[PDB]
Design a binder for this molecule. Sequence first.
Ligand SMILES: *[C@H](/C=C/c1c[nH]cn1)C(=O)O
Ligand SMILES: *[C@H](/C=C/c1c[nH]cn1)C(=O)O
Ligand SMILES: *[C@H](/C=C/c1c[nH]cn1)C(=O)O
Ligand SMILES: *[C@H](/C=C/c1c[nH]cn1)C(=O)O
Lengths: 257, 257, 262, 262
Amino acid sequence: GPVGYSLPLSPTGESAMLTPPPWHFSGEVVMVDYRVDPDAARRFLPPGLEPGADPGAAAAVFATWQWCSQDGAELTDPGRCQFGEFLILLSCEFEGRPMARCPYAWVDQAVPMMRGWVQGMPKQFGVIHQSRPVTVGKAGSRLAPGGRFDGALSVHGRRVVEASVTVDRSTDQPPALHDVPLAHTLVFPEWVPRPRLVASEVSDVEFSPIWTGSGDLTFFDGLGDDFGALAPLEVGSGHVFSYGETLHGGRLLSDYS
Amino acid sequence: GPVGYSLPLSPTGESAMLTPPPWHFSGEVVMVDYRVDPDAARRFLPPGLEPGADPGAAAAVFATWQWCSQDGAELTDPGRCQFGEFLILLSCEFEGRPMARCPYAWVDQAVPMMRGWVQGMPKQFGVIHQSRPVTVGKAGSRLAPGGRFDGALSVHGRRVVEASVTVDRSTDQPPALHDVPLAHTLVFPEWVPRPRLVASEVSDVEFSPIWTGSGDLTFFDGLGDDFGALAPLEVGSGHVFSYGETLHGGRLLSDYS
Amino acid sequence: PGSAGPVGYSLPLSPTGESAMLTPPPWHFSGEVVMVDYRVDPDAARRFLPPGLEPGADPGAAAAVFATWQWCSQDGAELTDPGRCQFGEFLILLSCEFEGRPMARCPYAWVDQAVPMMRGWVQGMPKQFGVIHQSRPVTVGKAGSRLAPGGRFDGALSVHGRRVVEASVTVDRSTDQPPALHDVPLAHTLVFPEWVPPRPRLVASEVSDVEFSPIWTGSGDLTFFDGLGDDFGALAPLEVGSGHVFSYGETLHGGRLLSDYS
Amino acid sequence: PGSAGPVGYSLPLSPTGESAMLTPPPWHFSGEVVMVDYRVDPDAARRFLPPGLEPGADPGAAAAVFATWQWCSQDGAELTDPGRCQFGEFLILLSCEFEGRPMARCPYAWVDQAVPMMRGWVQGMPKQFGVIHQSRPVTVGKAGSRLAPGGRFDGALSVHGRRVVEASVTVDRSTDQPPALHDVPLAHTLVFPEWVPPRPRLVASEVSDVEFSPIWTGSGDLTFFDGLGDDFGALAPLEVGSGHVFSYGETLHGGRLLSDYS
Ligand SMILES: *[C@H](/C=C/c1c[nH]cn1)C(=O)O
Ligand SMILES: *[C@H](/C=C/c1c[nH]cn1)C(=O)O
Ligand SMILES: *[C@H](/C=C/c1c[nH]cn1)C(=O)O
Ligand SMILES: *[C@H](/C=C/c1c[nH]cn1)C(=O)O
């Protein structure tokens, strides 16, 4: 019968929407660290994920990505291999080890959206915009002191997050929540009448120099009270950097059995 | 911990991208019946699904839908509750009973796309356009003899299906492939190192009068040789009609155990 | 007859004229409308009326109009490509008069397709780009409303990712009385920026073959939100009146000069 | 000083002028370009040149240009809204001359945002709407190419859901020599359809502060596909030459009249 890594199945397996991992990612990031209500954050952590050594540490992350499979085939079609993303990260721990939980994410392309659910990453669809550094002319900011970079997310036609960073210095210190494993919940609805906690296994994690400065972050109404509970109490430092990793598959943290 | 019918999980369950069934659908359809190579069609049928009593009977279906949950809440936001769809149907049988297999489908909204995979319906993302009947003025066709209606699908910026119907008469005879159960394969990729054949359980199936006439259908390159194998050998009658159903959940046809 | 360079009704010019983005008029329109009548600050509305246009007989009468359209040129060629011949629109209409005759001024319009947007500027309709959603009546199933008493229909406009207008109509009854602001000539201002170091003209859109379906009428609701600036906000509803759901057709031929201010 | 009705640099007019879709120039541009030089049928190209523009010193020189831009007005206000200040573009350029001076003619352009599209017509650039994709260089990870020898960069244009141009560049070396067609004035035709029963003008875009990054150059590949008509197809490549990847900036001030054909 027909085969494939994913739907649609086909006689050769070529029609599948998704390709098997590993997948490579190369992205540009605009990120703001912030303080979240720790009691709100705790309510987004499933069993096994405990509050972070700093329970109120969170981050808002805008990124633009290119991705490809092991053969690099997608790279020659920029429309296929590019997407934009916004996500929230919360600090947590699993068996005493620091991790990050992503309670919310949005992307602007279908393949990444579905692939997110494969990994347990709770992606929905949104419109996501992000400033890009310039090196010539006057219509933008250089990656240099005083450079400003903005991000915005709209969902169903309503503007729900805006962030800004004005950088003042370069460092070699990766932002903490972007340098720990992500712990996701793998679950799909049961169509015919069992969640698993998993971590994304990565290799070849790489950061550019990190441009850091002031951060600004505002949440707006339009995603509901549960999301609103994660709005910043205080906003910290911003960071602008490039990031790469290879995603291989999942490792089980717990199946609650 | 956080809950929900689907991701993202949240403390109240309100953040979930998908709502539990049942879901109601009301749609406008432009459909063309056609002859497919039966040996090509057979290769898209998984174990348990056997060739149709007429193995070469296929259909190309364009539809525009409104949908909602049991509470009707989505109806007040037309941007949330509308989508367009194109799908291929193939005639098959399960345990001697006529059914339809959908080997390929595309939609233009994220919620329906994900919900399709919940049901085993192999939806990907596309750009889908469809003529609408008019009742005033000159810029369109009436639902009346001589009225013409067109459909088009583009995927990743390449035009891959065009269809047309010019209607000549109204009937009370629902198109055969739109009036049998759909048999889907429920399978998700395994992220941490088992397909099921299921049928969609529906109620309250309703057709408007069926406007029927000549059909035209062309496939173009741009989805690969596996899809191309289902191109029409001959094109039959076209149909333009409205359709409603309520989708409740899945029933297991086989888990291959 | 004695033409040299490339030609065309509009840019881009080409040797045959076939490449032009726009076709010459007339253009035919067939649409579905969800409209809400409302009361505007008359003094605010007046400031949007150029010289030559006087306040309407009822200076506070305004309307918010959602429509989805199919259009084509005389030859009908666009109809076979639904992606090319369809667009959604949201308009504000204000009541006014030219030399004693009732007309409507459209101070703001949005559409979701490029050809209509540019063609709007040709006619003086001040179209910008937006995301526009509108309920459609259904006739089978449960996922929507029928054109019948109790039927509800909604419209929403977002611009640059910010929700700026929402309207709703719940219809009670059918009538043969077209809504006043949808049944009078539109008076636009033709002006285009001058690139080489503008002379506006007041024009009316000349139409024929205007046609309405029966009008379904009932309660209206309308809300403006922030995100288009204070000039737009000045036209927000003081009070909201009746809503209407109907189909509309017309043929647009060209402009008739009301004043060139000579 | 003595102004009555509503005002604005462009439609829509408003009491303060704040609602206008377009801002007055100058406008600043900062972009990333993927460009392929190619050989065009010179006789085909000539038919796209209006009176006053002569064939280029090399009449068969043409280029296909993909660019992604950020832009802003003098005050920089648009930069804080990336959705408002970014757009993608695809252009064809043809070599020509005005009174002995090298210039470039743009017979066709597409963009993916409404403000740039309309602003194009203000300047005479014949912009239509399309879907435009372009590779970006990466500096970390494996999912892309570096600006370095061996780096590959692709561009694609689709119009009305049909793929019409694809280009690729694989760079070998860096130079300080800007590609010829990207380093000469653009000569456009200003014309807008007449609504009330056109006078074209040949203009050059006046720019300052033109700036290039180092130019990465290598092999070029370019393919045109059906779906924009035979007039466009006449400009398809006979031969394809070098490709170039670079960053570009300029400030656009207004038009300079080359001929009003008086
Ligand atoms: C979704 C997200 C991938 C990712 C990796 N880091 C951050 N986001 C996908 O495309 O699989
Ligand atoms: C996807 C498809 C639903 C459907 C029902 N009939 C045809 N397509 C979804 O929205 O769940
Ligand atoms: C723009 C708008 C046309 C129109 C006619 N009635 C309402 N709107 C266009 O497409 O020309
Ligand atoms: C349209 C195009 C501007 C431009 C400048 N160089 C290349 N394209 C606009 O946004 O005005």
